[PDB]
Design an enzyme around this catalytic site. Sequence first.
Site, PDB file in Angstrom:
ATOM      1  CB  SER B  47      -8.739   9.293  -0.607  1.00  0.00           C
ATOM      2  OG  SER B  47     -10.091   9.288  -1.036  1.00  0.00           O
ATOM      3  CE  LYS B  50     -11.137   8.414   3.097  1.00  0.00           C
ATOM      4  NZ  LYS B  50     -11.245   9.316   1.912  1.00  0.00           N
ATOM      5  CB  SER B  95     -10.671   5.474  -0.102  1.00  0.00           C
ATOM      6  OG  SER B  95      -9.292   5.221  -0.298  1.00  0.00           O
ATOM      7  NE  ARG B 227      -5.274   5.317  -7.996  1.00  0.00           N
ATOM      8  CZ  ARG B 227      -6.272   5.295  -7.119  1.00  0.00           C
ATOM      9  NH1 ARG B 227      -6.613   6.402  -6.473  1.00  0.00           N
ATOM     10  NH2 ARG B 227      -6.935   4.170  -6.883  1.00  0.00           N
TER      11      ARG B 227
END
Lengths: 242, 242
Positions: B47, B50, B95, B227
Site C-alpha cells: 500500500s 498508493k 488503504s 510498524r
Amino acid sequence: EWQENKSWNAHFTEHKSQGVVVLWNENKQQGFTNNLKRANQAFLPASTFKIPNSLIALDLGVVKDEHQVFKWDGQTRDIAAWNRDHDLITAMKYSVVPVYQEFARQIGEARMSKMLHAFDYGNEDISGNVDSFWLDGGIRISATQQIAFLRKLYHNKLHVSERSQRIVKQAMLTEANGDYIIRAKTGYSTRIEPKIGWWVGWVELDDNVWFFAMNMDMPTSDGLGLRQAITKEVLKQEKIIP
Amino acid sequence: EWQENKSWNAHFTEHKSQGVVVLWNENKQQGFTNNLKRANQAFLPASTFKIPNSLIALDLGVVKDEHQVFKWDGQTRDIAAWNRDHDLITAMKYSVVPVYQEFARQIGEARMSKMLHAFDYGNEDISGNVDSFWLDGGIRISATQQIAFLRKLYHNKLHVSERSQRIVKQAMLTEANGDYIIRAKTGYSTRIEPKIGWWVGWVELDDNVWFFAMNMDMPTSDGLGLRQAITKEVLKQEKIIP
Ligand SMILES: [Cl-]
C-alpha cells in the site's frame, strides 16, 4: 439557518470566562452558536488576519513558498519565539507579528485594501498603519464572518490562486490524528479594549467538515489556552470529536 | 554518508520481531539505520505504492481533486472500511486497495511504466496485473529507495505538477501536534512471501525534516501496530520526538 444553543454557556461559566462559539455543519449547511448577538459582534481580527495576509502575500510573490526564510531583524522582543528566523509555516505556528508586518509593508496599503475587498473580509477597512491595522486599526470582523471567509478558503473559492490557498491551509495545520484534522489560527487583540482572544478554523472528519469561530474576553494572558479548551469542550459535547 | 546503529535491534527483538528502520537527517544529509544490509533489501511496496499511484492519477486527471467521491462498487469485502464511498483522503487513510486498483486500470500500463521510470521508483518493473503489480507483481523497492523517492516528493522535485505533489502530501497526513507533523503511508504485503509491513514518510520539525522508511516481518496481522510503534520508538531514542 441559525440556531442558538445556550447550553454551551456552561463551558464558558465553568472556566470563569465569557465569549461566543459558532459552528457550521457543511453537509447540512446549518449554523449553531450560544450567542447570536456576540456571534455577529465585530472585533479586531488580531493574528487571525494572518490568514488573508498570507494569501495576498503569496499571490503577489511577496512570499515565494512556505519554506522561504524571513531572517530575524535582530531586535529582541518579549516573545522569545519571535527572536529567530522563520518561514511561513513557523511564522503562523508562533504568530510572529514582525514577519507579517514586513509582509504588509511590501504589499502596500493600496493592494492590501483592494485585495481584501475581493475576500469580502469584515468591514473591508484597513485605515491605520499598514503594518498594524489588524491590531489597532479600523478593520473589524465577526465570528460568523470568519466562518464565511473560511468556507471560501476551504473550497478554494477565494479570488487568489489555488496554490496560495493550499499553502495557507497547510500553514494552518494545528492538530491531526486518526479521528480528525484541525486547521485553525489563534488571535489575541490587546491594543484596543475590549481585549479578546480568537480561534477560527475547521475540523475535518471522514464524511463532514465543521467550521468554527470563537472569541472570548481575555483580560489577562493567563487564559489564552481557554480559546482552544472551550472550543474542544463544545466539539466534544456535540460528538464532533471524541 | 551512512552509519549503522545496531542498538535499535533491541526494539525489534524485544517485540519478537525482525526488520529495519532507516532515518535520514535532511539538514545534515546523513542517514542512519540498524541494518545496512536490509536497508537496501528490496520488497514489494504494497500500500505504500498508493503514494506514487496517487501522484500519477492526479497528474493525469484520473482524479480531479482530493474530495472527488469514488463510489463503492457494491462488493462486500473483509475490511469493513472499504465497503463505502471514499475520496483520496479517506482512500489513503484506510488503504482502500480496490479504489486504487481502478486508478491503475485507468492510468494504463504504458503511462504507469513511464511515470515510475521518471520517478526512479525502485526497479521500475510493473510486470503483472496492472491493477495488482504492487501486491503480487515484479516491482520492488528498498527502504533507502523509499527515502530517496519521498525526498523528491517533499521538495516538489518529482516529474509531476506541483499541485499533484501538494495534494498527495496532504493525503499523507497521519499525525500533527505542537511538536511534529507526520506524513506517511503504511504497507502490508501478504500475497507473496515474505509477509512484511511498511511505514514510510517523514517527520516535520520547526527547523529540520526527518525522513524515515521501515519494514519488518509480518507473519501475522497481530504486529501491524509495531510498524508505527517501533518507528516512533527509534525516533524517541534519537531525541527526534518527545
Ligand atoms: Cl496538510
